[PDB]
Amino acid sequence: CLDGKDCASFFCCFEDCHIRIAKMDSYARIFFPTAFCLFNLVYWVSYLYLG
Amino acid sequence: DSRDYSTELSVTVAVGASLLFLNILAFAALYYK
Amino acid sequence: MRNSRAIGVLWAIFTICFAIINVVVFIQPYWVGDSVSTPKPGYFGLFHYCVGSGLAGRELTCRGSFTDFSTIPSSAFKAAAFFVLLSMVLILGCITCFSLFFFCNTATVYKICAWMQLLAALCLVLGCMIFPDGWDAETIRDMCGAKTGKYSLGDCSVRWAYILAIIGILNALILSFLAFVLGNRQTD
Numbered sequence A: 001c002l003d004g005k006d007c008a009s010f011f012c013c014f015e016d017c018h019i020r021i022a023k024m025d026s027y028a029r030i031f032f033p034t035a036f037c038l039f040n041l042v043y044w045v046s047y048l049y050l051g
Numbered sequence B: 001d002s003r004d005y006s007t008e009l010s011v012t013v014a015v016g017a018s019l020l021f022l023n024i025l026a027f028a029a030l031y032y033k
Numbered sequence C: 001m002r003n004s005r006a007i008g009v010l011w012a013i014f015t016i017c018f019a020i021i022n023v024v025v026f027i028q029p030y031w032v033g034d035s036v037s038t039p040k041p042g043y044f045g046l047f048h049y050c051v052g053s054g055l056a057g058r059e060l061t062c063r064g065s066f067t068d069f070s071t072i073p074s075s076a077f078k079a080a081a082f083f084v085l086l087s088m089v090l091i092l093g094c095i096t097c098f099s100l101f102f103f104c105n106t107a108t109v110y111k112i113c114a115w116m117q118l119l120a121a122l123c124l125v126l127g128c129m130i131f132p133d134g135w136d137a138e139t140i141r142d143m144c145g146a147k148t149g150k151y152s153l154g155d156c157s158v159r160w161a162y163i164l165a166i167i168g169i170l171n172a173l174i175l176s177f178l179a180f181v182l183g184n185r186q187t188d
């Protein structure tokens, strides 16, 4: 279709797909603290200020 | 009080329209060329 | 590449703004309000609702919390709250994957948020479409009027939070498309 190729290639990453599962540890090391910090921020702000 | 929310609706629509205008401006700037 | 990076930063900022909007509309109760032709003053959100006490409009009581499903007026309200909460969780999933931009490839991370923001948008649309189904509840009918019913605002009037949720739906759709285009760009 126009402005991109194959419909799916444009809306998915099925190309190539593996390698990233080995670096899952490196991903998690920064993923988990960010998620927990976001949860703490939203939770504390909502319970202290918006309530 | 007067329980009138036309002003609230107007200002909310104004800020929402401004935000959507900014974001569609960014989208159009990216999509050009 | 400079324009691509600037547009990515702007996209992230607007994504955070949409997440703030989603949290605010989920928490706040000012979705529907009262008019001069109303039996009593009040306003109800997804799960919370406040109604006047006595003849005087002052000193209005408040009731309802998401943690206590016994107080939510109706299953439609419960479903709408659940869907909006799912939208919150998905957009916060994007704001976490902003961390994953460090290691994983930019196109893959951009597509991951493109899909996740699309899913959050769909959840928010489903919640906003299911929420009016619960206006037939006894408390909502008492607050608004006998004319109130399923998908009929009746004497009550919509307040800022509902239109803000609609604006958030539009913002989420366009942001998902922007993320898709960014992911498909800057990889050749």
Ligand SMILES: CCCCCCCC/C=C/CCCCCCCC(=O)O[C@H](COC(=O)CCCCCCCCCCCCCCC)COP(=O)(O)OC[C@@H](O)CO
Residues within 6 Å of the ligand: A034, C005, C008, C009, C012, C013, C016, C017, C095, C096, C098, C099, C101, C102, C103, C104, C105, C106
């Ligand atoms: C109030 C308004 C909001 C203001 C806050 C605005 C937040 C601003 C940050 C946006 C990050 C996403 C921008 C888009 C990222 C686009 C990608 C980019 O910029 O470049 C990459 C990351 O760069 C980068 O430092 C970006 C790294 C990610 C930094 C984000 C950390 C998590 C953010 C936690 C949420 C906090 C904010 C919201 C809290 C409510 C590095 O290329 P590089 O080839 O060298 O890699 C090697 C590669 O080949 C993989 O091997």
Ligand SMILES: CC(C)CCC[C@@H](C)[C@H]1CC[C@H]2[C@@H]3CC=C4C[C@@H](O)CC[C@]4(C)[C@H]3CC[C@]12C
Residues within 6 Å of the ligand: A035, A036, A038, A039, A042, A043, A046, A047, C027, C065, C066, C067, C088, C089, C092, C093, C096
């Ligand atoms: C880190 C990512 C993946 C998920 C984070 C989701 C967090 C922020 C969500 C999950 C459940 C949420 C809570 C669910 C219920 C309520 C009760 C309501 O009256 C105020 C908001 C509050 C207190 C929510 C705050 C935000 C919350 C804590």
Ligand SMILES: CCCCCCCCCCCCCCCC(=O)O
Residues within 6 Å of the ligand: A026, A029, A030, A033
């Ligand atoms: C409470 C804080 C917990 C720890 C937070 C760590 C966040 C930084 C993530 C670091 C990931 C990269 C670590 C390896 C770096 C290296 O190559 O030496």
Ligand SMILES: CCCCCCCCCC
Residues within 6 Å of the ligand: A041, A042, A045, C016, C019, C020, C023, C095
């Ligand atoms: C003034 C209310 C601000 C609420 C912010 C909630 C956290 C947003 C995280 C994206």
